From a paper:
Bacillus subtilis can form structurally complex biofilms on solid or liquid surfaces, which requires expression of genes for matrix production. The transcription of these genes is activated by regulatory protein [name], which binds to poorly conserved, repetitive DNA regions but lacks obvious DNA-binding motifs or domains. Here, we present the structure of the [name] homologue from [name], showing a unique octameric ring with the potential to form a 16-meric superstructure. These results, together with further biochemical and in vivo characterization of B. subtilis [name], suggests that the protein can wrap DNA around its ring-like structure through a LytTR-related domain.
The structure of (Gt)[name] was determined at 2.3 Å resolution by selenium single-wavelength anomalous diffraction (Se-SAD), because no appropriate search model could be identified. Amino acids 2–83 of (Gt)[name] could be unambiguously assigned into the electron density map. Analysis of the crystallographic asymmetric unit showed that four [name] monomers arranged into a tetramer reminiscent of a semicircle. Following the crystallographic 2-fold rotation axis, the other half of the semicircle is found in the neighboring asymmetric unit across the crystallographic two-fold axis. Central for the interaction of two monomers within the ring is the β-sheet augmentation of β2 of one monomer with β3 of the adjacent monomer. Moreover, this surface coordinates three sulfate ions (i.e., S1 to S3) originating from the crystallization buffer. These sulfate ions are primarily coordinated by the positively charged arginines 50, 51, and 53. Two ([name])8 rings are always stacked ‘back-to-back’ to form 16-mers.
Author numbering:
A (entry chain A), E (entry chain A): 2 to 83
B (entry chain D), G (entry chain D): 2 to 79
C (entry chain C), D (entry chain B), F (entry chain B), H (entry chain C): 2 to 78
Write the structure that this text describes.
């Protein structure tokens, strides 16, 4: 198992700190993103590409990834695939 | 045991962070959902399909899932 | 050991998050239930059936079960 | 080792969440009970019988048991 | 190792929750006792006997024991002696 | 596995306290840096060189490293 | 490894609860002691003898010991 | 692995409580030192010798060491 997960373009997240990884489509997750953007808890790791996963950490940080949600989770074991 | 659980579509939840997984059929759980919506703690992972399970995590996040609660808990092992 | 306990009708609780499971038979736990209801911390998982166990979690959530307390704790295995 | 201890009549307490288990025979503990009662943090698991143990958990819940402290702690196994 | 320690007359304390066990003689510990007595965090487990150890737990509870401090600690392994 | 990671020039970070390590190339991260600077929570470990990684720890400390994120995470071993 | 450490006389400290053990020879540590005294977080286990070590635990308790810091840390193993 | 690290002159820190060990060479860490001094969170363990490492603990304590950061982390073993 990987302690740090690559969420795209070299950016890393500690697996032990993730609560949930989800699609950005719905309105509750978009409110969460905007609240984080406003409280300075948002991390944008998409490197300009399109957001495909929103990672919520236990410290109310919100991390935007260009990698799809389950691919992020799969990377806990080293590949995009499980 | 999996540490991340697919709760429907590609949405993942860390199993260690779950307090309870329940059906949304009662007034108290509905109050919990509305409260989480209003405070920016709701996560909706149903992709529009009907809510079958409500997952309460430990940071007071509430996650709506389209999968039955018992099916969510079995995915801990596969 | 089961990490999630079935508390009736497919509703699940994480065993590690339980503080106490008790009968709903006393004034203090009923004050705990009504407080949870007013504060939006109550979870009713009885599926319309008697409350036979009150589960208090470490987040001040209060979960009503149709299964009796010792039965809940025995389903840990 | 049990994760859940039967504190009498099928009422369960999580052993890891217990701070101390004491007899209810002193003024400081009785104030702890009264405070818990007023704050909605008291749980009464004595099923109508005399209190022989007061269990303090880490969430400042206070749980009354009809079983003496030593017997509560011995049921960990 | 004992998970619950007998601090005298059947009263039990969880070993994992103790921060410190100390003699009651000095003025800083007596202030701690009186503050706990006033905030309802004091537990008197001496069963009327003389206080010989003050146990401080991680939740700011203060527990008075009739057993001497190192005897309390020794009881982590089952006897008054190590 | 190392408990402490060298983030450059002999500066050490505890691997278990890291939440995320990211590049400093986006507006949201730069605000995180500026907030940390104003709050006395910023640590600058770049020894005078360009920032290539921003490490967020669980105590909301923010630590600037002259080493890219992937290289920081790879030094766990 | 011991989980309880004799810090002098019969006074015990849980090793897992210690943040740091230092000599009291500097102004900052003295401020920490006075602050703990005033807030009811000081524990004095020196039995009057001179303070050789200051033990900062994780609930902001400060414990004065009559034993040298390094001697306190070796008693973790004996 | 050593549970306590000697940071110079017998002063000890618990390795599990360290967030980061860094050189005192930048404006942000000096703001962290002075804030700790004003708030009563500073611990000076240099024994009157140069500060060569600043150790930030998870309780917002700040510990000044005469030993260089990488040396502190190497004494973990």
């Amino acid at each position: 198992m990987m302690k740090f997960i690559n969420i795209g373009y070299g950016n890393m997240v500690s697996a032990a700190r993730i609560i949930t990884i989800v699609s950005p489509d719905s309105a509750p997750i978009k409110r969460i993103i905007q609240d984080a953007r406003e409280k300075g808890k948002l991390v944008d790791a998409t490197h300009g590409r399109r957001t495909r996963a929103v990672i919520i950490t236990d410290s109310d940080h919100v991390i935007l990834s260009s990698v799809q949600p389950e691919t992020v989770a799969n990377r806990l074991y080293g590949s995009d695939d499980f």
